[PDB]
Amino acid sequence: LYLRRYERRRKHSAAVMLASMQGFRELFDGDNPAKKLLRDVGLVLADKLPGIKPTLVRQAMGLHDLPDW
Amino acid sequence: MQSFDVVIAGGGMVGLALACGLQGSGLRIAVLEKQGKGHALRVSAINAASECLLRHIGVWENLVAQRVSPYNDMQVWDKDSFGKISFSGEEFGFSHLGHIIENPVIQQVLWQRASQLSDITLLSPTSLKQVAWGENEAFITLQDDSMLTARLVVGADGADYGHHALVANIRTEHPHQSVARQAFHGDGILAFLPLDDPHLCSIVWSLSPEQALVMQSLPVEEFNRQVAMAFDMRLGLCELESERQTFPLMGRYARSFAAHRLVLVGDAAHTIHPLAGQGVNLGFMDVAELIAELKRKDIGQHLYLRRYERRRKHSAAVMLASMQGFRELFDGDNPAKKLLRDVGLVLADKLPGIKPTLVRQAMGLHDLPDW
Amino acid sequence: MQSFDVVIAGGGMVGLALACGLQGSGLRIAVLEKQGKGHALRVSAINAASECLLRHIGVWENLVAQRVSPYNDMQVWDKDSFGKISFSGEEFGFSHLGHIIENPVIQQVLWQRASQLSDITLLSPTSLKQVAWGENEAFITLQDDSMLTARLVVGADGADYGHHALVANIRTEHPHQSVARQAFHGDGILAFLPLDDPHLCSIVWSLSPEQALVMQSLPVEEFNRQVAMAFDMRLGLCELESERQTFPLMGRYARSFAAHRLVLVGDAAHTIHPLAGQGVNLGFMDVAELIAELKRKDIGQHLYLRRYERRRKHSAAVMLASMQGFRELFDGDNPAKKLLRDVGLVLADKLPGIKPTLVRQAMGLHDLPDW
Amino acid sequence: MQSFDVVIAGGGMVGLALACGLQGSGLRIAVLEKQGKGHALRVSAINAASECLLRHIGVWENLVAQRVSPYNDMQVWDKDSFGKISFSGEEFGFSHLGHIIENPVIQQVLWQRASQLSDITLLSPTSLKQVAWGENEAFITLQDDSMLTARLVVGADGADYGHHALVANIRTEHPHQSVARQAFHGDGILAFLPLDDPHLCSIVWSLSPEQALVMQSLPVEEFNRQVAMAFDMRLGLCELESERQTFPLMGRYARSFAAHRLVLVGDAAHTIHPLAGQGVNLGFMDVAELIAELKRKDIGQHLYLRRYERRRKHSAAVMLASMQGFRELFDGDNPAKKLLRDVGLVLADKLPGIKPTLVRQAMGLHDLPDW
Structure with a gap:
């Protein structure tokens, strides 16, 4: 009982990891020449976020996910 | 000259x-x-x-x-x-x-x-x-x-x-309220362009030539039904007023x-x-x-x-x-x-x-x- | 005038x-x-x-x-x-x-x-x-x-x-017996239309332009073989008599x-x-x-x-x-x-x-x- | 007459x-x-x-x-x-x-x-x-x-x-060395045809009409980058000299x-x-x-x-x-x-x-x- 709530959190984390792999693929398939044209002309609707570098770093370091403590 | x-x-x-x-x-x-x-x-x-x-x-x-x-x-x-x-x-x-x-x-x-x-x-x-x-x-x-x-x-x-594009005048149940609406469905896109009449739109339905032709030749009660489903019933029941016209x-x-x-x-x-x-x-x-x-x-x-x-x-x-x-x-x-x-x-x-x-x-x- | x-x-x-x-x-x-x-x-x-x-x-x-x-x-x-x-x-x-x-x-x-x-x-x-x-x-x-x-x-x-369509006159092993025959195979369709001669048909072969062109240019012994397989050998061995013609x-x-x-x-x-x-x-x-x-x-x-x-x-x-x-x-x-x-x-x-x-x-x- | x-x-x-x-x-x-x-x-x-x-x-x-x-x-x-x-x-x-x-x-x-x-x-x-x-x-x-x-x-x-085909003159980092080169990538094909200049090629890029159009309208620094990747960097960094032209x-x-x-x-x-x-x-x-x-x-x-x-x-x-x-x-x-x-x-x-x-x-x- 005091356990399945822990289970919730983990199955949750596994969905997040799945959604992330799906998200890397979307990002790469979207970095195409038509997007390059639109960047230049300022009509991009959907793109790499400002700034995903810092978000990519917090994910690689995984300093999210932590409890603290 | x-x-x-x-x-x-x-x-x-x-x-x-x-x-x-x-x-x-x-x-x-x-x-x-x-x-x-x-x-x-x-x-x-x-x-x-x-x-x-x-x-x-x-x-x-x-x-x-x-x-x-x-x-x-x-x-x-x-x-x-x-x-x-x-x-x-x-x-x-x-x-x-x-x-x-x-x-x-x-x-x-x-x-x-x-x-x-x-x-x-x-x-x-x-x-x-x-x-x-x-x-x-x-x-x-x-x-x-x-x-x-x-x-x-x-x-x-x-x-x-x-x-x-199939275009036509369509009377809707609900007022369009002066909103240009556009719905994607597969490789169909269906748009409702609001007109003077608070309940009338001119549509643009981008379809394959074969799809546009079938829609144009459908009986009207079927067209009415079919246009409204493709539009998520956003404006409710639909009724064609004008003729249905297509053009490449x-x-x-x-x-x-x-x-x-x-x-x-x-x-x-x-x-x-x-x-x-x-x-x-x-x-x-x-x-x-x-x-x-x-x-x-x-x-x-x-x-x-x-x-x-x-x-x-x-x-x-x-x-x-x-x-x-x-x-x-x-x-x-x-x-x-x-x-x-x-x-x-x-x-x-x-x-x-x-x-x-x-x-x-x-x-x-x-x-x-x-x- | x-x-x-x-x-x-x-x-x-x-x-x-x-x-x-x-x-x-x-x-x-x-x-x-x-x-x-x-x-x-x-x-x-x-x-x-x-x-x-x-x-x-x-x-x-x-x-x-x-x-x-x-x-x-x-x-x-x-x-x-x-x-x-x-x-x-x-x-x-x-x-x-x-x-x-x-x-x-x-x-x-x-x-x-x-x-x-x-x-x-x-x-x-x-x-x-x-x-x-x-x-x-x-x-x-x-x-x-x-x-x-x-x-x-x-x-x-x-x-x-x-x-x-590739069309041509084709002599068949077996008599067509005055049957219009049509076989679907992927996006190929191959039909045999019966003629006066009890063993001759005029075909209609709907193919992609690229497929129709290859078939038209195939040597005849290969065309004969290929037409018959696409027809399930329904009429047996096949022999082109006429020229092979295509048209969109x-x-x-x-x-x-x-x-x-x-x-x-x-x-x-x-x-x-x-x-x-x-x-x-x-x-x-x-x-x-x-x-x-x-x-x-x-x-x-x-x-x-x-x-x-x-x-x-x-x-x-x-x-x-x-x-x-x-x-x-x-x-x-x-x-x-x-x-x-x-x-x-x-x-x-x-x-x-x-x-x-x-x-x-x-x-x-x-x-x-x-x- | x-x-x-x-x-x-x-x-x-x-x-x-x-x-x-x-x-x-x-x-x-x-x-x-x-x-x-x-x-x-x-x-x-x-x-x-x-x-x-x-x-x-x-x-x-x-x-x-x-x-x-x-x-x-x-x-x-x-x-x-x-x-x-x-x-x-x-x-x-x-x-x-x-x-x-x-x-x-x-x-x-x-x-x-x-x-x-x-x-x-x-x-x-x-x-x-x-x-x-x-x-x-x-x-x-x-x-x-x-x-x-x-x-x-x-x-x-x-x-x-x-x-x-998009065609254009392209200066390359590495000499083409009089080699006609051709790279397939999906339904894109990109060829480099060697010219008099030891570092210049005329390309032929077979693309869908939509792809050819985007490439033609891309800014040049992006075109330079994009052409070279599609060519596996075979000749290194690339620089368009001439205009980019397309034809069906x-x-x-x-x-x-x-x-x-x-x-x-x-x-x-x-x-x-x-x-x-x-x-x-x-x-x-x-x-x-x-x-x-x-x-x-x-x-x-x-x-x-x-x-x-x-x-x-x-x-x-x-x-x-x-x-x-x-x-x-x-x-x-x-x-x-x-x-x-x-x-x-x-x-x-x-x-x-x-x-x-x-x-x-x-x-x-x-x-x-x-x-």
């Missing part, structure tokens, strides 16, 4: 827009045209940029006093991912994004301006028998054997496709052709666009830029022209990239993205803030020269 | 069918034609409805006495699901479903009738130099500068596609165009159809309905015409829906359906009884006006 | 090649043409067979002394399977496989030969007003009302597609049309080919065979002609089968095949030895008549 600076093949919306505009310029213009009060079958969704061309040429007030149907609000959604984006100019202090205006009104209006201008004369009903492209003159002829000459010639409004969408890989003393501007009125009913705007923008460039060397030489061509082929690639971009955005608004938003691990997403960028695009207040 | 009620551009099968037919009507008809005894390359599979048009115009007896190849029985199957449907008129008391008839025979016959009629004169070899579409007359001209005028003009037999199937999203004093009828002779060799029937039905409508106001005005256009575009959607329907039927005749038939849980299936509906469609005794 | 044995519509590379060639034959030839020193935008990769036609007609020495860019070595690879084949004539004792030659040089050269021949006169700038196809003469006319007659007429160099590849299901006293030869200069820059060779081979056949009955009758047509439609199927064959070869050069090679269980593979067959195809020393 008669001598002109520019003759204009096929005088419809865009060529006349060119006529009134390419004026106060020192150029004499000939215009060749080779040929009611109810809701027209054909309508275009005229944007702010286009409005600034028509207000400039002095005609806005006219078709305003006729019939104009302001929308300031837009909704686009996808039936497969359930993604959706909505936006307004009111959010950025604008009173309207565009106007739905009947094509016959637009053209018959610019026609009336045409002969209310003296450096324009109108030649109709006239078809071409021969054109001998000379170095300095056009040397074109008419079926009635009237010889004609021109510095440069420009064709428009007619003179390869992927989809057809003659986009998407063209809109400009320059040549030795020839300029072609695409039939933008019949060409694909991310925003339904907006194709003609691309044409009005072709000519504004052409008015701008033409009012100066020699007007006809295909050197001072291909640079104009660059700009237009460019604009057509931008429009193509934009349709591709709306699809990416909708297919990306899925549940996995929702999960990642919540947890802060989104890499790629709808930008802050595309509402304002969607508004600058709908209004098309980019694309303008100014002036 | 010379004055006519109707002039007919490109006088082939269908236009002449119109000529003999649009007669005893008070209309003077002009007809513009711009240009052996062995088995012709080109054949059409003429149905009962078409027969009732040709028997009416008095010509049936003629090409009967020439060469006619009655089929009363038909077989269609699919090489992928192994689904198959066969049917006969004999089952419903009919002696024939149609006739395979050579195109040259049909046309040269209707040509002979043409000048055996006095309200028809034939103009050839003549090409058009100019046509100035007037309000009340056609005002068309000829290359030999002979001025010409007409109330309405109608074009046919020529004057976008997906597949090409100019269906499928058109067959009618009405305009101000202009009517266009599609080149139905070269257009896709569910039943091989049957395209021309759609043309003969276009004109029967046109004969019917024309023999009354003004014959030319595009008001009493677009309603005719509605009916034809409608017929083309029906033909499209039918091809889609044959594919659904074959892909549904699979082993899981067989299991469910046995156990009585089929929801959707071949109808009772599509044999009789397949017969009414092959005979095309629908589509008729009567009269 | 003036009387000619053969008049040639649209006098570009191929028609003139026909002119000089269809000569010393007893035939009088008319030729209708309806209209710098830097690296031209348009180049063709002229093979050994084509060279033997141009050396024969006496013109080789000319455009040699102008500008010629010998390649003896070729590399083709696929970015997906990593398959690749490279080959040389040097391996079989040949000094060159072909030459990259600018189109303007080729044509202006054959033009100079044209009037350096007396059974050829050149008519320009002239467009056609009317052609009345007679039984024995062509009876064609000109816009300047000069009547003209001909036994047979032949059109070329202009007068359906799948891909567009008007292959692939045609190249010949015979008719009653009409012969059409395809615009081979703009048609798909397995070997980049080689389309025009198919045209030069059309005419060599046509020179051969024409120098004998009546030159015009469409009987002694359709057999010529057979041979050409045949050649177009061969070219189609070849492109299909390059793709099969690359998709088959995969790791499972590598494993089987090692263990000796390969059933189907690159033949011993396709290097020599790749050389006979590049040189096109097949296809020749001899003579």
